[PDB]
Amino acid sequence: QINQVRPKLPLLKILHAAGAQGEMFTVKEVMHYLGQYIMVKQLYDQQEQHMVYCGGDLLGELLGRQSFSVKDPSPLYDMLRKNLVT
């Protein structure tokens, strides 16, 4: 009930950068703050707003990707599986 997670340190830093506070979050809050992160760092393509260009951002480092489409988010799944504890 409420599956609280503790983001690993690099991911926590991304969430803080997006306005998050503390170090324990619901998965939903994590996704909220990751979206916000992308908005406020303008990592998305204003012309094709589903495409994220994360390469050379810490986020791209975490994902192991230069880019991803929110339309095909397997990379995000892989990354969150590895970087959210309990």
Binding site: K28, M31, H32, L76, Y77, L80
Partner: peptide, 9 residues
């Protein structure tokens, strides 16, 4: 579903 978790407006 993370897309669903996110979009529960």
């Amino acid at each position: 579903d993370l897309e669903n978790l996110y979009f529960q407006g």
